[PDB]
Amino acid sequence: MGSSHHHHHHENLYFQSNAEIADEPVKASLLLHVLVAHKLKKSLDSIPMSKTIKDLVGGKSTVQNEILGDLGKEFGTTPEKPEETPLEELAETFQDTFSGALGKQSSSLLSRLISSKMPGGFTITVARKYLQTRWGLPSGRQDGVLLVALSNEPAARLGSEADAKAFLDSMAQKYASIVGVDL
Questions:
Q1: Which SS3 state, helix, strand or coil, does residue 163 take?
Q2: Dist CA 22 CA 91 (whole Å)
Q3: Could you tell me which residue ranges the Carrier domain spans?
Q4: Per-residue DSSP letters for 82-150?
């Protein structure tokens, strides 16, 4: 529009509404999902919560016995008959005692992605160096994005690991679809 224009007879009130994501911690509904998915080399899109540890592996006795100890490290304990409790109900039991932040397995398995199929030139320290300004993510939300990064595990999606920092821009949205937040 031209300078010193009349701006028409139109008018409006000052300012407008705004919103931001809550600082709510991670839920066991995501941590349980990734710890089983990564053990079965499956994605969260192929792990139905409506099933059990014994039904997910097809009744295999070994993996069923390994997963029985994998949640005990990440939740400090496990409920009764967990190998007969589906993940859609087990997660509802795990959040009753979860610390709201990653366990020792779901924080150490994150660096294995960087050596499983990822290229070279990038690190896990520079992957968590910033998120509260790259996407505005609050401190309680950043702990769930790395869980979804471990379940994505691309076999080939980057020609250089210097571009893997731009790959974290996707993961922020992958997690938002799970909790229903906006970006």
A1: helix
A2: 21
A3: 26-101
A4: GGGS-HHHHHHHHTTT--SS--SHHHHTHHHHHHHT--SS--SHHHHS--TTTT---TTTHHHHHHHHH
Q: How far apart are CA 120 and CA 181, in angstroms?
A: 32
List the Cα angle 182/35/160 in 5-degree steps: 65
The encoded tokens of residue 9 equal 């007879």
Method of elucidation = NMR
Q: Do residues 90 and 120 make contact, with C-beta atoms less than 8 angstroms apart?
A: no
> If DSSP states are collapsed to H, E and C, what string results for 33-83?
HHHHHHHCCCCHHHCCCCCCHHHHCCCCHHHHHHHHHHHHHHHCCCCCCHH
